[model samples]
Target: PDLSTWNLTIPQGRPAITISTSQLQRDYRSDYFQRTADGIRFWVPVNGSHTRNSEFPRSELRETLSSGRPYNWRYARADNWLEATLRIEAVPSTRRMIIGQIHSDGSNSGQAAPLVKLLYQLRLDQGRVQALVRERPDDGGTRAYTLMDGIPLGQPFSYRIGVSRSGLLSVSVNGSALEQQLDPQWAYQGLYFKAGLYLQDNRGPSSEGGRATFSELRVSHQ
Candidate 1:
């Protein structure tokens, strides 16, 4: 994985710890973030520390412009895309895990709520990947779309999320694609990409945390 443009947040410390892009580029590694034969392994315990603004813990990456400065853009300003190849290693007892997100960046006087979340859920002895989209920035209401089905844990898979300059949104899992149009209100807000493991449950033992090893992660805006 090319981590030069990404900053990492591990589920450790009072408000969690954020590793700068320079540090990651320098080959920083820890128990929570490790380099393995498969790829970069990200692990976050269920009871691990989290950011002040979040209730869940994550060992994830937030797209950045410089060091800690976040990268954000209006939908009409650029074509934004985030893609990743990964394998799920573990999931909390909640049977759900968040793998990727499109989040608001507090631009235009926004609250920085997430606009969409890419989720993996295990049920009925099967695993499925789905997405949730928020139609309004202020309300918590969201719509769900199933992207792929029958993906078992430990299997390798890939996903792509793209937003065009005209508010056309598209998502693909293992080459199958789904499309959605962004709300007009989103065009006035700044948005960014987040990738990696973000556990949905905080009520179980640490061993029940979420873990994923990502072999590829890339974000492009042009």
Candidate 2:
């Protein structure tokens, strides 16, 4: 749940193996990461494997700094957080799934985007939770909102995403709250924080994709 700050990108080999953070706190497992009695079970699978230009397929979590570096900052710096206690448990036939994010990694002319994205859509059997919001970093789209809605597949919900320190952007699902105001051109670029299972449907065949189970994840900064 809290592997020192975080780092674990699965969907295995050739361009997909991250898992650092003292080897996930000396408890790393594979087959798209596992440990499940209920918690740590990411499982990507729609043919899993992609991280570079991202075509979709993830077993994510990537915000580091327990000596592993890369935990970037600057929403105005000083107060940032990411909390989770998830459950999705499955979704692939394009039912979408990008459990959490805040990325915007390199900007200083080196471009990179997406300031928020915490989707988890599902259809036919109802499930919803959203948060697109990319106020400006060239903002062409993104600002969807919708915090919670029927939620079904395995239920358990919880969220916390924040950014205060003045930039304000917030979200809290299962407890309902959603603030906004993070577009001072993103304040100075470099941001971080992400959580598991990204599978947005890459053709759907290897038995489908996206399963979540986080049980409790965290990343906080003062």
Candidate 3:
């Protein structure tokens, strides 16, 4: 796919990219994420914290094809399926680095939050990888579940995330698959796909963080 068609988002410090937002700055440096010949890369400091910043040191590239006005979430949410090939260029110095996220942007926060309705994440946890999901109820509060876990990492792995309008989720990682049934109340929420590195640590020095490269990131929903 053409990388130029997407928009980049970095932390709030230093100079911001044209399509960037500064909602996740936590005294960490910039330039930690960038585009590559085959995919994208993300690097975070060891002491970086996603707590006070409300998120983590993440460099996200969001698809702009469906970022239309009047605020439409159905067009962004995956109706049929989404897939990608994640290549681990390097292991994370910390425990976790969110490699991908399927989130909604309907909230006033403009960032992922409890009100965002739904989120599907692919994460690197130590030497293993996992796929996680978070959904919110119609009243309030959040519910989370682990879709898949204990999958070893190192080489490239492919994942397919499928969602139905009725809130059924089917995911497969390198052929190992898992299914989840959710409340259909979230079927019409605004959602979008995010890929890159999002470090989940805030201890140690500035040299500590996660590193990885991604390729063959393809998404289609019908």
Candidate 4:
């Protein structure tokens, strides 16, 4: 949970994804889709305290970990601490890249302790499993990389997530490098755009899936 190696920074005008901060103005008591909110919500919280930027959102659940990278969001939270990265590229069209660690038990209940769900995701063609551990998510179409070998969920590990102009991928985690793990790579890079450290909390019966901390996020020209 140390961010010594990670440098936090954001570009002046880098296009990654669409956002609406106004969408977050309403009561935060109900189910929300950040896709509909205004401004960007990208950042990680460390042990309850976080770097509050205007474009970020408050920590929801376990957001008490330090984010080692700079982000566009004005708010961020982290707990139980997991770090990851987000790389966004806008080459005329829109494309996105995400790599981060997450909790598994969030989708289940007390019976099941929360586990890690790390991913190096991209919006190209088949959503391949760049470098992952544990089981895969239930829903995701055209995944090119699927982290097979059951790797450790939690703990720190070096990882990468990015997309090529032709849709080729480059994912690296721990020592297992899945650089462009799929064949048809990026056959369907959405024209509009798609990217981010996607967090899914399919918490079993408890429905207690909570917050996710992402660090080292960058957006630059491809």
Candidate 5:
């Protein structure tokens, strides 16, 4: 995946760091993300601060698509399937790491709460990996369900996630698969795909974080 065309958001809070590739390679204390030979890597310092006052370290890349319309904005849509091959080059010291996600922005400006998210994660503490589907209803309460688990890691594995026009969410790991029904409300919201290291912890030595390699990444609706 040639990620130079992708947008990057690397935020910092403590000790203050800039959002440049140079700083990402220089400051080990506050830096958190970088692109690799054929994939992208993210770091969450054991003692690193949040991104611009937020609560997590984000090293993410979004599809360069439209902002608010669901049908034509993202590379994948209802009835479309997305897949990628990834390797956990190195595991994190923390319990979890968000490796990839299908996220839906609840607003036209992309500044509001997310209507839903299909998070593809690796739970290092549990010795497994999974795809977690979460949604926020009108009243703002969040609910989530694990769509699939028991995925082996530390080596290369192929993952596939698909959403039918009817909101059927399908996920597959290595070759095993499972399906879930998604809320219809998310069908009309702006959605996109993201990949990289989104560390789930913040307390350990300064050298602890998540690393991965992604290849054969493709999204299609046909």
Candidate 6:
């Protein structure tokens, strides 16, 4: 399986994707991307105006998700890119996981939300948001995790989420890991490998969004 062009689009729609084979080169609205050994990466760009403000640490390369759109774009091998892992060790950003949506104009509905999101949602603001994983279609809303019962937008916070080998959901905040396992939910149940941020609904009506910079991504056999 190769990850060079292993791009996945959330919401199962015909979203646009762009790639840059250079360092620090970025796309405006791409969602997912894979980096080559030489540093070139492929991904789905976000459509927003926010810039990366802080410096990120570097870590080893973990596994990249090969799951594709309208189906599963996991573990895809192409001539230009190999299915490699990404792992970058860097200083924590505000002790919270990176928020998927960024409203450049601070407009209420200017960020895109992912309908089929496969991200790690930790430290939710009670009643504000929830996490969904390994859900069965016939089960309705059978298994999932909810954090932050209620939360106000424009707040400063972050969370951490990961797929453990035990086949469960693990979360953390600021570097402190959570101690409980999340109930299973979502489609294509199995090894919950391959990590990426999924967005679909914009915070506003202008169709603006942000990018998810995942520095360290790695994976292995179960």
* Best by the lDDT measure: 1
Residue 33 shift from truth in candidate 1, angstroms: 1.1
Model 1 C-alpha RMSD to native: 1.5
Which residue ranges in model 2 land beyond 4 Å of their true spot?
1-20, 23-25, 28-39, 42-60, 65-67, 73-87, 90-98, 103-114, 121-125, 136-142, 145-188, 197-211, 214-222
- Residues 1-222, candidate 6: write the lDDT tens digits: 233323332321233212221221232232234444433232222322221221221111122233222122111121111122222211121212223211111122222122112222323332123444323323333233454433332332344444443424344333333333423332123222233333332233233222234433333332
Q: How does residue 127 of candidate 4 score in lDDT?
A: 29
Query: What TM-score does structure 4 among the candidates reach?
Result: 0.33
Give candidate 5's root-mean-square deviation (CA, Å).
Answer: 5.5
Q: What is the lDDT of candidate 2?
A: 0.81
List per-prediction Cα lDDT, in the order shown.
0.86, 0.81, 0.53, 0.28, 0.55, 0.28
Enumerate clash totals for all models, in the order shown: 0, 0, 4, 51, 2, 80
**Candidate with maximal TM-score:** 1
TM-score of 1: 0.94
Between prediction 1 and prediction 5, which has the larger lDDT?
1
lDDT of 3 by residue, 1-222 (tens): 445334555544534232422322222234565556766556556444343434455565665553312222453254755577766554334566666666656453334432221122335542445565555433444444443454445467777766666667666667676677765545556666666666665456665555666677676666
Candidate 1 residue 81 C-alpha distance from true site, Å: 0.8
Model 5 segments more than 4 A misplaced: 11-38, 66-78, 108-126, 135-153
Candidate 1, residues 1-222, lDDT tens digits: the string is: 778678999999998888888888788998789878888899989999988888889999988875657678788988889999998888888889899998887676447778888999988567899888887787666788999988888888999988999999888889888788877888888888999898888788767788889998888889
Against the true structure, what is each candidate's TM-score? Answer: 0.94, 0.34, 0.68, 0.33, 0.68, 0.36
- Candidates 2 and 3, the one with greater TM-score: 3
- Model 1: CA > 4 A from native: none
Predicted structure 3, TM vs. truth: 0.68
